[PDB]
Design a protein around this motif. Sequence first.
Motif, PDB file in Angstrom:
ATOM      1  N   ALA C  30       0.951  -1.048  -0.088  1.00 33.90           N
ATOM      2  CA  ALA C  30       0.006   0.131  -0.001  1.00 33.90           C
ATOM      3  C   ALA C  30       0.937   1.217  -0.081  1.00 33.90           C
ATOM      4  CB  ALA C  30      -0.942   0.025   1.123  1.00 33.90           C
ATOM      5  N   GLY C  67       2.773  -1.504   4.005  1.00 30.77           N
ATOM      6  CA  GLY C  67       1.265  -1.477   3.703  1.00 30.77           C
ATOM      7  C   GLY C  67       0.433  -2.232   4.439  1.00 30.77           C
ATOM      8  N   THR C  68      -0.851  -2.397   4.134  1.00 31.79           N
ATOM      9  CA  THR C  68      -1.824  -2.984   4.564  1.00 31.79           C
ATOM     10  C   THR C  68      -1.763  -4.735   4.421  1.00 31.79           C
ATOM     11  OG1 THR C  68      -3.336  -1.098   4.557  1.00 31.79           O
ATOM     12  CG2 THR C  68      -4.373  -3.009   5.364  1.00 31.79           C
ATOM     13  N   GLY C  94       4.706   1.186   8.848  1.00 31.48           N
ATOM     14  CA  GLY C  94       3.105   1.728   8.988  1.00 31.48           C
ATOM     15  C   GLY C  94       2.508   1.141   9.725  1.00 31.48           C
ATOM     16  N   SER C  95       1.122   1.953  10.132  1.00 33.39           N
ATOM     17  CA  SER C  95       0.370   1.480  10.910  1.00 33.39           C
ATOM     18  C   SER C  95      -0.489   0.275  10.682  1.00 33.39           C
ATOM     19  CB  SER C  95      -0.662   2.677  11.454  1.00 33.39           C
ATOM     20  OG  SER C  95       0.064   3.683  12.124  1.00 33.39           O
ATOM     21  N   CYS C  96      -0.759   0.095   9.457  1.00 34.60           N
ATOM     22  CA  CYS C  96      -1.693  -1.019   9.053  1.00 34.60           C
ATOM     23  C   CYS C  96      -0.956  -2.457   9.155  1.00 34.60           C
ATOM     24  CB  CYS C  96      -2.099  -0.696   7.806  1.00 34.60           C
ATOM     25  SG  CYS C  96      -3.179   0.439   7.397  1.00 34.60           S
ATOM     26  N   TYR C 103      -7.629   0.690   9.453  1.00 34.86           N
ATOM     27  CA  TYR C 103      -8.641  -0.575   8.851  1.00 34.86           C
ATOM     28  C   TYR C 103      -8.569  -1.460  10.059  1.00 34.86           C
ATOM     29  CZ  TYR C 103      -7.812   1.952   4.532  1.00 34.86           C
ATOM     30  OH  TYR C 103      -7.501   3.082   3.734  1.00 34.86           O
ATOM     31  N   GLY C 125       4.137   5.382  11.934  1.00 34.46           N
ATOM     32  CA  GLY C 125       3.289   6.454  11.286  1.00 34.46           C
ATOM     33  C   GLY C 125       2.529   5.997  10.132  1.00 34.46           C
ATOM     34  N   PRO C 127       2.011   7.628   6.288  1.00 33.90           N
ATOM     35  CA  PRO C 127       3.174   6.354   6.492  1.00 33.90           C
ATOM     36  C   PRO C 127       4.367   7.216   7.147  1.00 33.90           C
ATOM     37  CG  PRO C 127       3.245   7.708   4.428  1.00 33.90           C
ATOM     38  CD  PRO C 127       2.156   8.229   5.084  1.00 33.90           C
TER      39      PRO C 127
HETATM   40  S1  SF4 Z   1       0.097   2.637   7.592  1.00 34.33           S
HETATM   41 FE1  SF4 Z   1      -1.434   4.184   6.447  1.00 34.33          FE
HETATM   42  S2  SF4 Z   1      -0.082   5.377   4.978  1.00 34.33           S
HETATM   43 FE2  SF4 Z   1       0.825   3.505   5.564  1.00 34.33          FE
HETATM   44  S3  SF4 Z   1       0.530   2.078   3.852  1.00 34.33           S
HETATM   45 FE3  SF4 Z   1      -1.107   1.755   5.932  1.00 34.33          FE
HETATM   46  S4  SF4 Z   1      -2.932   2.868   5.083  1.00 34.33           S
HETATM   47 FE4  SF4 Z   1      -0.986   3.851   3.715  1.00 34.33          FE
END
Ligand code: SF4
Lengths: 82, 98, 156, 110, 114
Positions: C30, C67-68, C94-96, C103, C125, C127
């Motif tokens: 993502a 990414g997710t 990243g957070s996902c 999500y 973050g 991102p």
């Molecule tokens: S943590 Fe957020 S900005 Fe990063 S890939 Fe996931 S949805 Fe996109």
Amino acid sequence: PLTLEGIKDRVLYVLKLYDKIDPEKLSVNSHFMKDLGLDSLDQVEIIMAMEDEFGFEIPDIDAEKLMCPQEIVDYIADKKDV
Amino acid sequence: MSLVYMNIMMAFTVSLTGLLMYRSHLMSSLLCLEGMMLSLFILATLMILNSHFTLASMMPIILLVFAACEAALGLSLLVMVSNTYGTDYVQNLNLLQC
Amino acid sequence: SRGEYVVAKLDDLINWARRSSLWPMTFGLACCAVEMMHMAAPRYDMDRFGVVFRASPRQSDVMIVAGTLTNKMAPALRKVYDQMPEPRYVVSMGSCANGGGYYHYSYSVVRGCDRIVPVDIYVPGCPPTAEALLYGILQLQKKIKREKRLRIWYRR
Amino acid sequence: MNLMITLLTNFTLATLLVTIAFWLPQLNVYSEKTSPDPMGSARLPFSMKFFLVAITFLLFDLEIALLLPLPWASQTTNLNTMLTMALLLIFLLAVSLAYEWTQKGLEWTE
Amino acid sequence: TSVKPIFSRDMNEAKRRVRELYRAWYREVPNTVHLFQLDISVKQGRDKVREMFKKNAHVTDPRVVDLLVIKGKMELEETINVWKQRTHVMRFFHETEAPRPKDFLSKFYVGHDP
Ligand code: SF4
């Protein structure tokens, strides 16, 4: 497939291979539903064991009308020469 | 006769016996046939270099080229067999019994 | 002693060679793949750290989950993780990938990639900036630096 | 003699580097791993085009094998015959190429 | 009370489609155990297919069993064409889950749910 006797012996051998049918109560004129205590899916996997053994396809509107090994051997006799 | 020539002839007859007792594949037949061609190249080359016979030195190359072209033909035949049956098995090549 | 000194120097050698030659297999899942691409872009430039750009999964050293992670691809994530030679490492970006992120309460999202793979560095973050992803890569290198493989081998 | 020693040393260095590349990480007791690609259980279909370009390589390679003694054949006394046969071999290689062209032999790997 | 049918006009054609779907799943269980290299037997997979057909057996609506045959053909298409992985086939076999308590007393012992 040559004689009716070989087809009848092979029908009874297929139905004694099948585990849920009791081979003692298994006869030539034994009904599947009310006598042998079989589900309809049991009857359909019986018909597919018959397809695996006799080597041809059995359609649906004539495998619903196979409720005993006598009608099975009569159907295979009708669909062959014997 | 001589010794190293007897060795190259021994290799030719060994690849002949492998070419005359088929196991499974047609590629094994073509490999034994080209081992025979290789031994013919080696033995012709040792004779031609031994006698210092100069004009025959082009002969093994000729003996290579044609026969390598021959091998190409054999490979193509194998391929058409393997396009009909899926394998190159020699027991699929038995329809001409009748 | 002497053998303790030898295994300490050889630990320093193999830890130096492994941390200064990390090859990443980046999952471009993502939006974090875009910021990984900025971390490979000239300004931040992973390649000058020994961190090559888009190594193949069957020779890579660190898996960057950027990414997710959804439920349809989590078996593919674990498959590519199982195809990585050891010592393999996982950086979650990243957070996902850390915990599900935006999500988290979704029906189709794996709530953190650490439900699937063992994760070494969590990069936060949405991102994380490419500078922060590079911070996580250098923190992974410092984690590889303080490994004690031959020391624990000599002591077991 | 020196060539055989050099081939043997190159072969020994190659086998030594392969042996180091296999036995040095097998000191490690890392993990015995389990659970074994674009196909899972599909067979290989044959492709006729790859075989056509292989046989085309072999036939032009035979024509090159004929063309190889030309730097020696330039030194001969019968230069008119030598030039005619050199041009004839390269022309037959070109005729084989044109026949490979026009019968769609060089297609989908042109 | 008059509705538009999907494929079946009555339960005869509906049970015909159920029956041919069961025929196709019976023909597909051994290939599924082979090529997915599952750890189950063929009889165990056929027991699972029997359980999945006897789970929905109480439906007397022809449109509902038409959609159940449609969704079973979709599961079959995802299994024949190798679109499911090993995990998607083993999700029918709830192996990592502990068996849930069925009687009153152990459900009383473990929590609040009926
Ligand atoms: S943590 Fe957020 S900005 Fe990063 S890939 Fe996931 S949805 Fe996109």
